Amino acid sequence: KDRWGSELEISMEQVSASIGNFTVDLFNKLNETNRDKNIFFSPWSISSALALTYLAAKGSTAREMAEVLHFEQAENIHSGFKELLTAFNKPRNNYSLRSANRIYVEKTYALLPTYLQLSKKYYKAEPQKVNFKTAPEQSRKEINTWVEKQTESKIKNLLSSDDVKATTRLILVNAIYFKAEWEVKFQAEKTSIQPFRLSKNKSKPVKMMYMRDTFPVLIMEKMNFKMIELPYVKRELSMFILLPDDIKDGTTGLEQLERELTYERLSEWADSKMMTETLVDLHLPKFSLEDRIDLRDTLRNMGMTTAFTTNADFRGMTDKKDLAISKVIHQSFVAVDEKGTEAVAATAVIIS
């Protein structure tokens, strides 16, 4: 029967589905303002940090978070996060994948022992006492140093001076690091400078990688796009790319795609039975992106409001109703080249 295995796979499916739904909702919200900019984030990192926060949440504070983060269909969302974390951190020798969580707490501020044992259980987050009251900069620096260590030195200064203050009582941090070679690597010899068209009337040079090989491709004629899967070693992870057939609008060529984007659509396309192995002439830019944002305003616009107010209820971790989220800092990095991809991010939920 293996009802234990079946249950835990359902748990994991719940969190994966939540993260997918949250990814599209978050992108759609970020896109409303930033229609013409690069966007890059780790929804795993954001959701993990906010799930560790959700663990402490009660009442309408919790209910709002569950709705925005899509935790509604789960009796124990924290179990799914635990099992996914365990899967990602499973020891291996063929590529790098790891994620970690940590609780930074004001040394004077006592947290409920139930919260700490559940945080350790589900998120492997250990509490570290720090002096926020009379040493914010020393506390900020040690946090940034941990994040630096988890991100292979790619995120060296996650928190700024404006983020950590004397009023800060708790900082819940997630980090994720990924680096893997492609299953089939590009030959640098075949890389050449080519135009990347930002629009019908604008282009810039990029180093364009090239290979001819076989990849899963979905051709969606009636929606004028194609999608390709680019496996990393052993196909345990892949990069999916969704490309409109041309630039057929007045901006990026993504207007229609972004208007019609849903997780339901994204999900069924990615695993479509019509996505099949196809010999392709693949041209892919060598590119890198960095991003940093305080998601507070974004999350409030999505419906997570109470958590950022004086009425916030985090009595899952404390007996005092004196805590509220001040900031949700997220920083990300990715580098795509001929050998593979490096991707890394961190999220700090700052509570005062």
Binding site: F27, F41, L198, L237, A343
Partner: protein, 33 residues
Amino acid sequence: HVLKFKVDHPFHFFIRHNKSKTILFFGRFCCPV
């Protein structure tokens, strides 16, 4: 004949853990550097 897949204009991309189908990273690339 070979299918042309030329990524020389804006696209969406994501990195997925395939067994669980979890999206670990998501982005849009529309603007070099």
